[PDB]
């Protein structure tokens, strides 16, 4: 069932005339380039990008916003450890120490609640979480929306 | 072309 070729299909599809029609995209046909999943050009001509997002995090945490950080634990591009360390830098206090959260009877990943931020790992999921662990990804999303901690048991 |  997992198919690693999704980007190919997508590309085929979005480049279809009828699909753009239906989407109301490229109304006049003036985008005279093939639709692609990413732009290598922009990818390659990027400018400003602060090194740390932490300060924003501090600001919004102080502003009382809800902040959740998650990570698919089999991704190696922006891996869990990178996240653990970055969040670790905020120095927040822990309200609920690293614990296993369950989906049904299975451990979906783990989570730790700090004062002002919730961290959640999604077990066995790569970079595209809702792609590799769709079921668990949804649970994650529902809890975040509710502002409730990932479920134990 | 590196995608995060």
């Amino acid at each position: 069932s997992y198919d690693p070729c999704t980007e190919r299909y997508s590309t085929a599809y979005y480049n279809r005339r009828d699909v753009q029609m239906a989407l109301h995209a490229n109304v006049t046909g003036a985008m005279n380039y093939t639709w692609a999943t990413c732009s290598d050009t922009i990818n390659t001509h990027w400018h400003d990008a602060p090194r740390s997002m932490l300060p924003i995090y501090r600001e919004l945490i102080a502003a009382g916003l809800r902040i959740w950080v998650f990570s698919g634990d089999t991704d190696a591009v922006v891996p869990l450890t990178a996240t653990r360390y970055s969040i670790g830098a905020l120095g927040l206090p822990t309200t609920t120490s690293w614990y296993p959260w369950y989906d049904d009877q299975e451990v979906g990943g783990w989570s730790q609640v700090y004062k002002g931020l919730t961290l959640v790992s999604v077990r066995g999921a790569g970079h595209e979480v809702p792609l590799h662990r769709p079921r668990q990804a949804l649970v994650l999303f529902q809890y975040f929306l509710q502002g409730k901690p990932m479920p134990g048991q | 072309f590196x995608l995060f």
Partner: protein, 255 residues
Amino acid sequence: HAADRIARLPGQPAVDFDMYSGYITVDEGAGRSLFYLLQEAPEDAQPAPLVLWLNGGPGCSSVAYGASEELGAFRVKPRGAGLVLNEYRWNKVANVLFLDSPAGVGFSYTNTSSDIYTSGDNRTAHDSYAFLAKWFERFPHYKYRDFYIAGESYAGHYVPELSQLVHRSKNPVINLKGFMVGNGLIDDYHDYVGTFEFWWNHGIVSDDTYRRLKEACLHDSFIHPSPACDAATDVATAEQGNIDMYSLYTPVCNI
């Protein structure tokens, strides 16, 4: 608004929720316009929150990923033949707004060609903010809705950057409640550190390369690595071999 409504996409199964897509000009002077895709929750779930979802790259499309192979309502069949419904689509619980950003990505476009050579986090965000303000004027029934911003990867930048503008904007119509970041850039230094450690702990580089990476990249940013950093990562790449770095235990696409 009604004009952006989608009737049916090619190959689309019949569903019980609506979708809209279209353009919003975010920079008249430059002729920059962003394309969006809105996938709503069924009635039984309304009025559900509004969630702005953003993919990273930078230069990757929210529609292509987010909507098409991730949390979006459908998945594209092979050969781009049609669609299947995503049984775990996040629009089962929220009104999901996918934004192709920045201009130049996906279906988003710019009238000033150089725009595509000058992108940066700042403009990206300002334009996104613009997009929103305007978007809400087009979908005024969404004003005041609980609103969240979420994304993955490079969107670890985009999300909190936008969030901060929104927050600071003091835009009364936007009821920003928070944001969520998945596998995202958070802090270059720490991220670099955790990255290499993780790789070494997953048996993907040599000890020497681990060490070379730590020494070459630590003062750099993910997006703009030094030449030492790149030389080091070229070796890591060679050590990694033909695996999918975005999912270590899954196969690479063969076509």
